[PDB]
Symmetry: D2
Subunit: 183 residues, 4 copies
C-alpha cells in the first residue's frame, strides 16, 4: 500500500487562498492524522525543512517544520554561521498565529517546493514566535530566530496565500542551474 | 550546416545587464546582419512577437518585433479586441530609445521566452514610440498603442536588464498549464 | 462564472492509466458536456491541436481535435507542406478506436502539454482512421493523413496511458528554448 | 571572486557530443586546473554527487565525484542500505575508462542536473572499475559498487554524449513534485 502525493505548483489557486482553520471536531482525529503524516512524509522525501497543507492541495491551517542535523552539516561552515542555521526537531502546528519578536530584516536566497527549480533573495524578520495547537489540541509556542524563523515565515505565508515571489528581490530570481561562483 | 541557437533563461547575467550600443562602424556590416537574421529566425520559430539580442546571449542594443495576422487571428476576437491586438510588419531596431506617449496603464498576462513556461499580469503603458536605427542605419520613429506598445516595452526592458517578473502583479504568476476558463 | 483548469504533468498517475470507457448512460448528458466544453476551452487557450480527458485529470475515453486555419498559417508554408499540415474542424470522440491505413512512418518533433516545454522527434503512421461516438452517441469516423494523423495518434496514446517520451528518439529530446536554425 | 556558472540543459548539443581527451601537455597545467576547480565548485554548490565537464560547456574528458558523509546521511537509513549508498572522497578523473566488474543490473530512480527537475528509473551495473588520471597525471583506479557505481556510470555516459533519458524506463519518468509514498 503506496499512493501518490504531489506538491501543488504556482497557478493552482489553492496556493493563493487563505487556508481555513481546522475545526475542533477534527483534533486528535484520523483525517488530520493522515494529513500530518502525509506532510511529514513529503517533507522528508524532498528534504524540505517545512511544508504546509495547501501545498498538498488541502486548504487548511496545518504546517510542519523539521531541520535534521545532516542538512545543517552539508551547509559549508561559514554559510551555516551567517544563515544561523541550526537543527531543530519536528513540530506540527494546527491553526497557528505569528508574532514578530525581532523585526530586523535578513536577506538570503530562498526557494519553494511549489515554485520548483528557482531561488531568489527574500528579506525575513530575524526572530518570530509561532503559537498554535499540536494535532491533539495541546497549545504549542515556539520562539525562533535565524534560519528557523525564516522557515516559519515561509510556511505561515503559505497559509495566508502568499508565496516567496510576492516578497523577493526580483533581480535575484534564478533557475537553480545558474549560480554565482568564486574565481 | 544548420546551427543551434538558444534563448538564455533567467539566472544568466546577460539578461540583467545593460546592453551596449552598436557602434556606427558596425551598421550595415555582416556581423550585425548575422545577428538580425538570427533574431528573426528565432522569433519566427518560437512564434514570439518580439525578441532582443541579450536573449540570444549578445549584450547589444538590437531588438525585432513582428505580429503576423495569423497570430492575431488565433486570439479569440473578444480577447483580441480587449487587448487591441492588430498585426504589424517586421521591424528591427538598433540603439532604440522609448518615449511614453499615453501613460495610462493597461494590465494583461504576459510571458517571456527567457522565463519559459510562466505568465503573469503586467501593467504597461497604453501608447509609446520607439526611435532608433535600422540595421542599415536609417533613423525610424514607430508610434504604436495597445498590444504593439506592450511588446515594444517588453523588448525595451530586455535591453535595460529588466524582465517582466520585476514589474508583474506577482499574485497572478502561473505555470502555463494552469489557466482560468469560462464555466 | 469562472474557474481554473490545469493540464496534469508527467508524474501524475492519471496519465499512465488506461482510461475507462464512457458508459452508454452518460452519453448526451450534462456531465459529459461539461467535460467536452472544458477540453475544447483548454485546447483553444493553449493553441494545442488536440487534448484528451486524462490530461484534465479525468480517466475517461474522450478526446478532441481541431486545427484552425489561423493556427495552421502560423507555421511557415515550407514547413507546413513538409509536415502535410492542413486545417480541420473540431471533432470530439468518445470511446474511440484506431485503425492504421498507411503504416509508413514519418518522423518529426512533437511536444505534449502534459510534458510542458520539451519536444522530441517521434515516428508516426502516415494515415489512420479514428472511429468512435460523438458526445450524443452518434457513430463518427475520420480518415486522416499527415499532421492530422499524428495528432490523432498522440491523443489516442494518451487514452492508453502512453506519452510521447515512451516512443521518442531520445537523442532529439530538447527544451523548447534550444533549437536548430538555418545559417 | 564573483563570476557565474551554469549547468547546460538538454538541447544544448554539447551534451550529446563525445568529449575530447585532455592532451598529455595539458596535464598538471593551469587551464586544466581552472576547469577542475570550477567543476568541483559547481558540484559542491548543487550537492550533486557527480558532474562532468560537458555539463559546464567544456567538451573534454573530465569528471568529478564526491559523496560527503552529511549528504549521505540526508538519505534515510533503509533507502541508504537498499541503494548501497556510502560516502566517498572527492575524485577528479581525466581521460577515464570504465570496465564492468559485476553486470548484474540494479534499477532505482536517477536524475540529472542537465535535465533539471525530473527523475526516472534507470538500470545500472552493480559494480564497475573507473581508471584514469588525476589532474596531475597520476594513474588512479577506483573499484565501486552500488550507488557509487551508478554515479560513475552516469558521469561516464555524459562524456560519451548519453543522458539518462536514453536508458530509462520511460513509464517512470516524473516531475520531482510527484512522488509515491507509503500509507
Ligand atoms: Co514554499
Ligand atoms: Co522577454
Ligand atoms: Co500530449
Ligand atoms: Co547528469
Amino acid at each position: 500500500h503506496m499512493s501518490f502525493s504531489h506538491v501543488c505548483q504556482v497557478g493552482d489557486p489553492v496556493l493563493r487562498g487563505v487556508a481555513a482553520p481546522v475545526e475542533r471536531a477534527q483534533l486528535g482525529g484520523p483525517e488530520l492524522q493522515r494529513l500530518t503524516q502525509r506532510l511529514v512524509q513529503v517533507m522528508r522525501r524532498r528534504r524540505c525543512v517545512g511544508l504546509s497543507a495547501p501545498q498538498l492541495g488541502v486548504p487548511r491551517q496545518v504546517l510542519a517544520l523539521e531541520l535534521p542535523e545532516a542538512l545543517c552539516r552539508e551547509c559549508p561552515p561559514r554559510q551555516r554561521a551567517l544563515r544561523q542555521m541550526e537543527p531543530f526537531p519536528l513540530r506540527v502546528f494546527v491553526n497557528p498565529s505569528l508574532r514578530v519578536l525581532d523585526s530586523r530584516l535578513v536577506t538570503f536566497p530562498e526557494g519553494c517546493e511549489s515554485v520548483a527549480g528557482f531561488l531568489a533573495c527574500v528579506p525575513r524578520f530575524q526572530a518570530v514566535q509561532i503559537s498554535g495547537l499540536d494535532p491533539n489540541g495541546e497549545q504549542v509556542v515556539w520562539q525562533a530566530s535565524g534560519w528557523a524563523a525564516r522557515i516559519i515565515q515561509h510556511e505561515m505565508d503559505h497559509l495566508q496565500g502568499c508565496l516567496f515571489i510576492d516578497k523577493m528581490d526580483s533581480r535575484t530570481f534564478t533557475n537553480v542551474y545558474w549560480m554565482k561562483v568564486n574565481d
